[model samples]
Target: LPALKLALEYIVPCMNKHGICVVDDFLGKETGQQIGDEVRALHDTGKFTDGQLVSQKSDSSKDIRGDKITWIEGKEPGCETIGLLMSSMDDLIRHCNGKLGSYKINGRTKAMVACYPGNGTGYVRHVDNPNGDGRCVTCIYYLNKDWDAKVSGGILRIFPEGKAQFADIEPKFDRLLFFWSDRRNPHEVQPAYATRYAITVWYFDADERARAKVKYLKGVRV
Candidate 1:
């Protein structure tokens, strides 16, 4: 708990200043490897579906995104580690709301486990929530172990709201990234030479949830 509080102390200020922050060794190497192994096993079972372009709703475009994704309830028989991670994130969200003062993050979407298969698969630049979908914060945890940036590629490129220069972040093992879900952060996934794995969840603001009319709250549950 103290560790989580300490993490938030740094993360909250960074988000306030830059709208994004990256933290390494979030759950440590052992837990990260375990989660990675579970995701790999699940992928081997062909549980993930081809990622679709949201606005287009088509798989016809190859340049858009090539990853596969599976949503997690975090309570499956072999997903204990992921379940723990989700609960930790829940707590973190509560802490973050307290620190931010004005945020009313009451719920989160289902966690999504995504895999970009090798051979140059990538996602185009985009914002997670562009239409006031009630998503207040976007959180992502990477599970690529021993990732080599120069060889494997798959780095995350972020364009902060007011920053003139974009930031390129490596997909290192046990890294967690947080940022506002609105237009403040536009990001992309670089092409992957080796398989890349990541899990993401979006926390929703209560006020926005009540205001959004498109039923964007369907996937979110507290």
Candidate 2:
């Protein structure tokens, strides 16, 4: 206990100034399994065209690797089972409270939930969420029931030390990895087993709505 506290004394300051923290074993035992079941249920419905959301830069890859991400509307019936997860995030934002900080919707909040199934060789090191533009929080819920650390090494490297790459999150089920998104939070998925699975969720200002608010934001940076 003393050692962990001592480590945090220094770590917390850097994290506070830069903004990012990780929560392992986040949902406890039963809840983690429940979220996994919810993810599998959504996948089985085949509502997803492809499970990977390969960003624009990944388009030119020789093997056409990566970008299989599936999503469920927060309001979706099946997704309601995961509402507990949402509640937790609400608490998270409330805890952080501020611009570039965290703010729980006293009245309204909206977000997108996504599940990832990589080709085991895609998703070069990349951040889960970018810090700019009201990107308040980034959370990932691991769904892989049996992730092998040997042959597969898909861990998220987080640099919350404000300089060093000392902190990180390994891909494992039941771990609700949470962090404040920013340049310091840059991460990526390394090659994994034949398959890599996880439910990744992001909350940010609605780009479409923001465009509606500011005229110039209609296209670029909108």
Candidate 3:
């Protein structure tokens, strides 16, 4: 993970204008195992939305913040749900806190997404949490048993620059992916291996930090 920190020395500058970055292999084996286990618990009981749009597939799943089609409904506060969220919250703050100015929950807490195995089961492309008005960040955790490229194929494509091109990163188990959210940082996952899985959550520009800017439209001349 320290290596990942160094990579940022080069990444942040590029992303400053573009708004996205990727850190490959963020966690070790043991950590990946722990997260993967948690995903199964939630998948067993949670409700899922497999990316079908009532209107059209065109621009639906990619919309992210406001897709009328829902993603999976998770086991909130259950062993598979909130428990994992808390675990991620603790660690995200530990690693990303001061580095990114501080990590925070959208509210008291929010549940994460657990994907299915196989291609297209992962996700297409989209944004999260920000709702189009403020800056946001997302933390995605992977938990696949003894994962390898052969066993899993969930590639996260991040388009940091305002351009449409994407920087794809593999979803190795126990690995965590973080990115800034706005029109600039568009991203998505390609179809993954069967038995593939992950848990995703978010951070918003709220609390005492960016609330004033978010609440007040500071620009138009009075």
Candidate 4:
């Protein structure tokens, strides 16, 4: 709990001022490794599906993003560790709302486990919630043990608003990344020579969620 407290203390202030933050050794080495192993097993057993674009609704744009993904609801037989991670994220949401008076943080999306097979698989640059679909915070946890950034290139490159230099972050083991989901942070996963594993969840703002729901219902009626 001390680690969790420390992480939140650092993350909230950085996200408030910079709209981004990175924390290494987030869940500790052992837990991170166990989660990584579980994801690999599920992937090998064919539990994951090809990731698709929100608009495309299919794998027509696989070249743009080539990761296979599966949702984590914390109910699966071998997903206990993922469940724990989700619980930690729940705490993070609560902490954020408590610390940031302006943030209407309400809930989060289902956590997703993503696997990008080696040999140049990567995602194109994009904002997580370009059309303001309620998403406010994007949190990603890396699980690739012993990753060498020089050789295996699954670097997460982020462009922060008003910053002259972009940041290239290595997908190292137990590394956690947080950023705003809107256009303030445009990011991309660079091609990986070695397989890359990560989990992601998006926390939503209550106000944004209500507006987005109205917009969605209007479109549905049209």
The candidate that achieves the highest TM-score relative to the unseen native structure: 4
Q: What does candidate 1 score on TM?
A: 0.88
Listed in order, each prediction's TM-score against the native is 0.88, 0.68, 0.60, 0.88
How would you encode candidate 4's per-residue C-alpha lDDT over 1-222 as one tens digit per residue?
464575467877888888888888878988998898889888889998855433353555434446889998977899989888888877766766756536688889998889887767788898899998999899998999999978989899999978899999899899888889999899998888888999999988889899998788744563
Error of 3 at 64 (Å): 19
Q: Model 3 segments beyond 4 Å from truth? A: 1-28, 46-85, 88-91, 94-109, 119-122, 129-135, 146-152, 163-165, 207-222
| lDDT string, candidate 2, 19-63, tens digits | 655556666678778876776776688754464544446444533
User: What's the candidate order when arranged by decreasing lDDT?
Assistant: 4, 1, 2, 3
Model 1 weakest lDDT span, ten residues long: 54-63
Best by lDDT: 4
Candidate 1, residues 1-222: lDDT per residue as tens digits?
Answer: 354674477778887888888878888878888998889988998889865443353454534546889998899978888887788777777777756437788899988999988767788899999888888899899989889989999999999877799999888889888889889899998889899999999998888878885664345788
CA lDDT of every candidate:
0.83, 0.55, 0.53, 0.84
Q: In model 4, which regions exceed 4 Å deviation?
A: 1-4, 51-65, 218-222
TM-score of decoy 4: 0.88
